[PDB]
Structure 1
Amino acid sequence: MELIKGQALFLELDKKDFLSLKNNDKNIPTFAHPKNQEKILAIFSLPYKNPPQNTKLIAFYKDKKEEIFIKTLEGNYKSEKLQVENKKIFPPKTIQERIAKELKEANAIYSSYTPKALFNGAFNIPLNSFITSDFGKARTFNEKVASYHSGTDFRAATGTPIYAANSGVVKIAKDRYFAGNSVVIDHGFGIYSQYYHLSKIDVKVGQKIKKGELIGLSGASGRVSGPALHFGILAGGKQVDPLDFVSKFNAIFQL
């Protein structure tokens, strides 16, 4: 199979006699195919930065092992040279500690696997706008990726209502350094939607929300380049192309 870096893939496996899906010694979780009773599904995601060239997954069955080969593709991402390699910046210690703290909290939430569907049918777009900056737009030095856009920016004047892309449980609902006023929703199966730079948060941690329910107001919080909604998807442990993901998910769970 082939997969563009920074994208997710839905692997289809036979259910009967299935034991384990493995990436070397890492376990990949599985969930029901919602239409085909004989199949299960796994989410496999490639990181945008420094992906392997090739992956081998092994589905272990009681009666057999099946190897899955995935070739990593570069895709057609927008990319710009910078002319300063200053990878080590010297923030104030207050900033350094807030970032490290918020990183630790995020890692703990994305670690808490929900082995159940919290969602309800297809993902909606969180507002009726258009993309102003694409997922995966890269900054390069040494023909190497130094940084990338890890979600997608929607056109939103300050105070635009933002609605939950799908049902789930709010796990983050506060002000963070890089994301500003942030909402993060667990949808189950390690799938998380992310709404950043909000001017107002209308949900609390641990709240069950419904698809199309108000989660806050768009803003420019934490945003140098002006007001927008930043929308992200974390799936299979990685930030992935969110409209590509929503499209692949919806093809499976719409009906």
Structure 2
Amino acid sequence: MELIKGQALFLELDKKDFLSLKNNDKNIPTFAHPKNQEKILAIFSLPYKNPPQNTKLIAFYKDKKEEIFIKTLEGNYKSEKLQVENKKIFPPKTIQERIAKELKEANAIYSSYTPKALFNGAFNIPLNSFITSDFGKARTFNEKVASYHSGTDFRAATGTPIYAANSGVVKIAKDRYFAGNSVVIDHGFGIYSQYYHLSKIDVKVGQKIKKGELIGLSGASGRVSGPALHFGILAGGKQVDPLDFVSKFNAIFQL
């Protein structure tokens, strides 16, 4: 198969006599294919930065092993050369400390696999706007990828209402350094949706939240380049293209 870097892929597999699905010694969780009962699903993601050229998964069954080969494609992401080498930058310890802590808090949350569906049918776009800045917009020195846009930015003046893309449980609901006023929702199966740079947070941590229910107001917090919404999806342990994901997810889980 072929998968563009920074995208997710729903794998279909026979349920009967299935034992495990592996990427070398790392396990990959599985879940019910909701319409077809003889099948199960797993989410596989390739990182945008530094993906392997090829990947080989193994679906072990009681009676046989089934291999899956996935070729890593490059896609057609927008990309600009960097003038100045990125290098190490030297923030104050006070900030270093905050970042490093908020990172730990994030990694703990994103490696807390919920093995049931908390969602309710398809995802909807968090607001009825348009994309100002695409996912995957990269900045490169020597065609090595230094950074990229980990989400997608919608047009939103400060105070534009934002709605949960799908049902779930709120895991983050506070101001953070890079993300500004962040909200992150666990939808189950390692699928998290992200809403950043809010001007206002209207939810707590631990709160069960309905699809289309209000989670906050768009803003510009922690954002250099003005008011907007930054929407993100983490799935199969990686930041991925949110619209591409939504479209694949919905194709399967449509109400």
Q: What's the TM-score, normalizing by structure 2?
A: 1.00
State the shift of 1:86 in Å: 2.9
Check if 1:132 corresponds to 2:126: no
Secondary structure of the corresponding residue to residue 193 of structure 1: strand
> CA-to-partner distance for each residue in 1:85-110, whole Å, 9 max, x for gaps?
13200001111010000000000000
Please report the RMSD computed on the Cα atoms of aligned residues, expressed in angstroms: 0.4
Between stretches 80-89 and 202-211, larger displacement belongs to 80-89
Secondary structure of the corresponding residue to residue 233 of structure 1: strand
> CA-to-partner distance for each residue in 1:190-213, whole Å, 9 max, x for gaps?
000000000000000000000000
% same residue: 100
State the shift of 1:143 in Å: 1.1
CA contact (8 A) 2:86 2:146 kept: no
State the shift of 1:115 in Å: 0.1
CA distance in 2, matches of 1:25, 1:48: 22
Give the corresponding residue for 1:190. Answer: 190
> CA-to-partner distance for each residue in 1:134-186, whole Å, 9 max, x for gaps?
00000000111000000000000000000000000000000000000000000
CA distance in 2, matches of 1:240, 1:82: 23
Secondary structure of the corresponding residue to residue 199 of structure 1: strand
CA distance in 2, matches of 1:161, 1:81: 35
CA distance in 2, matches of 1:198, 1:92: 25
Secondary structure of the corresponding residue to residue 129 of structure 1: coil
CA distance in 2, matches of 1:151, 1:213: 21
Q: What's the TM-score, normalizing by structure 1?
A: 1.00
CA distance in 2, matches of 1:44, 1:143: 25
CA distance in 1, matches of 2:83, 2:215: 39
Secondary structure of the corresponding residue to residue 187 of structure 2: strand
Give the corresponding residue for 1:145. Answer: 145
Between stretches 116-125 and 80-89, larger displacement belongs to 80-89
Q: Which runs of 4+ in 1 moved over 6 A?
A: none
CA contact (8 A) 2:132 2:154 kept: yes
CA distance in 1, matches of 2:236, 2:44: 6
CA distance in 2, matches of 1:6, 1:45: 7
> CA-to-partner distance for each residue in 1:44-102, whole Å, 9 max, x for gaps?
00000000000000000000000000000000000000111132000011110100000
